[PDB]
Amino acid sequence: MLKLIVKNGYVIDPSQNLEGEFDILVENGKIKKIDKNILVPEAEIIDAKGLIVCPGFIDIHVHLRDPGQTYKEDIESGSRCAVAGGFTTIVCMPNTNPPIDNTTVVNYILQKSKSVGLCRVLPTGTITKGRKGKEIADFYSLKEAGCVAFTDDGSPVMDSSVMRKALELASQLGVPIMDACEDDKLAYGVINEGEVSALLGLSSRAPEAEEIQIARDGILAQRTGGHVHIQAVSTKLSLEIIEFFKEKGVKITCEVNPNHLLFTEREVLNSGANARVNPPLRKKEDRLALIEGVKRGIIDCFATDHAPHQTFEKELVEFAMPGIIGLQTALPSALELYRKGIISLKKLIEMFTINPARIIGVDLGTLKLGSPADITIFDPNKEWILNEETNLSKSRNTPLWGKVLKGKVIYTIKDGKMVYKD
């Protein structure tokens, strides 16, 4: 590995308004040149003919379950999922055990991720000590150790001064707060407060629980000057509120879990506990609004909230752990919107690359000369099935289990090294 060439693919680099049939030369893990028919003496070649070539995808919302819940997933299994899904960078959430609220846990993750060596794993810290919601965590030490953001995911912050103080201390450090928006007085049940909760009598989680905290966060972001990133947006009103603050110049970004683009609460009737997730799958009108928010640029990126749980944690809905895996299914799920002509291919790539890069302030999601050779190569049309043959997660918890997907990664490249191939 001095020299690599990605030949004959259809390159798309939205960060540079760059697209067409170009080759890419990689030198020492870095992007060296992008040009028609490049040829160099003694080069590694991967042939991308008929395929899409773009920056490595970045997922800013992943649960690696490591430390403490490694029977669900661990840094290795999650990293394999990531790269098999086209991700060269993932941000891991801090609801591990022990939680990421000290530099020992950060370092453990960084070192283990280096040993695994497939994608870049960027840790976040908790907003509060122990994620108990009471006292701000040591942002200064956690950022210095490598945390890129603070969240209490998957717990909301209930005290408004705690959230304000988080935003103040984080912005002072130049990093965002990622907020898990669900007021715990209005969201302590198991599924959406809609038709399915009404029909079955399952306890519910009110859409206002999410909306009220998003509105709170926009106001706090506005008044503190901090940047708040809203995780897994799930309702129409939510998007309206976000846009209202974006219109004012507030540093508020957001993401959508592709599952919320594909499924409604009705999925609880078809997939049972594999449709239990926080925030819940909500109504048709919400699903369609989300797609509209993707189209209109209100939703800044796709992020999986890859949240693996074992099958015995996905039995009776009432007792089931919330969450859906998604790293391996993000791309075909997104490509569904491309196929319906809702978004362009460039737009889909933006949402996986440069947009998430800008949210967390990393110079990635790009094929700019001199930048790391993180490259994803994919077939928008290749069909496959997520099943035992194909699943890289330790867990299986997704309503897309066993269903036909269209769109698939052929190559994932990280610092000029092929870390995944079909």
Add this chain to the structure above:
Amino acid sequence: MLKLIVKNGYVIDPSQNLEGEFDILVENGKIKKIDKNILVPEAEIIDAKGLIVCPGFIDIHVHLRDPGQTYKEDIESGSRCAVAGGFTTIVCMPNTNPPIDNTTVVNYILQKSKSVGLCRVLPTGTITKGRKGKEIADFYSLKEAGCVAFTDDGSPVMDSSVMRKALELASQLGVPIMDACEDDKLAYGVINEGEVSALLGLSSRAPEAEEIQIARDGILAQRTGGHVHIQAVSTKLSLEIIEFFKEKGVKITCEVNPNHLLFTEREVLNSGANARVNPPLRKKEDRLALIEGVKRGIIDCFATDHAPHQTFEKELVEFAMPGIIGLQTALPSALELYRKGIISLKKLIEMFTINPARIIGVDLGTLKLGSPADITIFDPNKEWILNEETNLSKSRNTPLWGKVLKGKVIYTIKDGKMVYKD
């Protein structure tokens, strides 16, 4: 009293798009006819020549301090203030002692107000038992006894399900929630979080405390179908948020304390503790936004939050009770906006009459044929001073104490009976 005629005044009844020089005939406490030069055998006459004749003003935010704090004010002293200020109807707040959370306190107030016999006093109930914020109050019994709305004024409701449940049970009964919007984690100091708190080191109350709860209430109103009325709006962002929900068809109304139209936090430096109020007086930009919200119809009515406290409760700002009296000063204060050409005279009257009537769902604030003869007659140009000679409150707590006011009530009429004259 069979027959009364209000002669030669300039009548304005915005509810009917009615204005001009007309006489008003009153028969048995009711409006009988409105016409040019009416004359009837053996009639009482009050001459309104050169004066403005309009429906009695309604103030939907008054502290009567009765029961329990009658050294501040009582039903009698507050009613005299009301009528001297042009108000034939006031809504009293439930932060009395004991608070209005049972039908005994409601009935005491209704009966005492009947005995006093000057203006109609309409009680509200608390949102929570004891106003402690934990358990919803008995709305059903309180409404049946005569309460027209529920509020925990001057305490916010901190639990979101409590507020949601209040809105649900109130809308079921057809009555609004009036919410005192100030998140207690962000508003536990004494003055605005602005220049004056920074300069002096007085504890502060963050504008976001108000904004976050208004945003919460709009969302709750939207999702429950209830009507929420936002009390004493004080910031620019607040008005933006309200308008955002009004635009969506949400039943959300609001009011402005005229003091917030006249004064900023700087008044704490000139008037000391008589400028201590919740929500606080904020910045110039907020003051001007409020005036703009009055102009653009975002603010639905004027309401005084008449909040009397004794002089010994208005000494060192840190220990002072929050609040400003305002019933006698509301009209000249409002007329300041008329004089600057910010609002028309019709608009000023709307904000004191039909708009507050519609908020609380009473058929008042009108000179419609058959309706109660509640009539206010005033001189927009008459100068006076609020001082010992002129004050009808038991308390003196207003930065307008001793200052020249322009605009003054000459007559107040309630059910055809003259209850006040200059």
